[PDB]
């Protein structure tokens, strides 16, 4: 199933982070944990979108979600996590960079 093969990339990230071999029904607990976390990801964004009165997800509610989970604090920002955990193609499209003529290619 394409929902099973799409979550299996995060199964292999779960085997890479723990650095241990994992039992098969224990990995079925992780695939039920990621199914209810993605349900709770969609539940937290619809509270954040109906507070502003819109149906299109803006990135500042994604900035507000890591501040309430403790991932982004006063000393660790959102731009720290992109430049250390994501590659060069994803660093270009997200973080604004400075170029010649004061031009920004992700222009806001």
């Amino acid at each position: 199933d394409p929902h099973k093969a799409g979550l299996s990339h995060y199964v292999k990230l779960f085997s890479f982070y723990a650095k241990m071999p994992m039992e098969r029904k224990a990995l079925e607990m992780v695939e039920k944990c990621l199914d209810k976390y993605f349900q709770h990801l969609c539940d937290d964004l619809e509270v954040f979108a109906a507070h502003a009165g819109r149906k299109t997800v803006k990135p500042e509610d994604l900035e507000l979600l890591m501040r309430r989970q403790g991932l982004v604090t006063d000393q660790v920002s959102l731009h720290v996590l992109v430049e250390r955990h994501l590659p060069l193609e994803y660093r270009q499209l997200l973080i604004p960079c400075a170029y010649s003529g004061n031009s920004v290619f992700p222009a806001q």
Binding site: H9, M20, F38, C42, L62, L86
Partner: protein
């Protein structure tokens, strides 16, 4: 990031919400840190109970702490 897969998750669960360009990269940045906070507590619960193989209750005790911080 599986950007083709994250459009299939967001439409089958809630078919009324739209996502812009590069908004799923912060969804993938959330999901890289969610598994890393799940595997850190599962390493903590395995080394405290002196058991090398991570059992189902070590995942379930990590599911009561990390998912509790996700709701707000």
């Amino acid at each position: 990031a599986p950007r083709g897969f994250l459009k299939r998750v967001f439409k089958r669960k809630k078919p009324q919400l739209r996502l812009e360009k590069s908004g799923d990269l912060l969804v993938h940045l959330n999901c890289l840190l969610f598994v890393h906070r799940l595997a850190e507590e599962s390493r903590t619960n395995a080394c405290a109970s002196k058991c090398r193989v991570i059992n189902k209750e070590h995942v379930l005790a990590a599911a009561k702490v990390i998912l509790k911080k996700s709701r707000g």
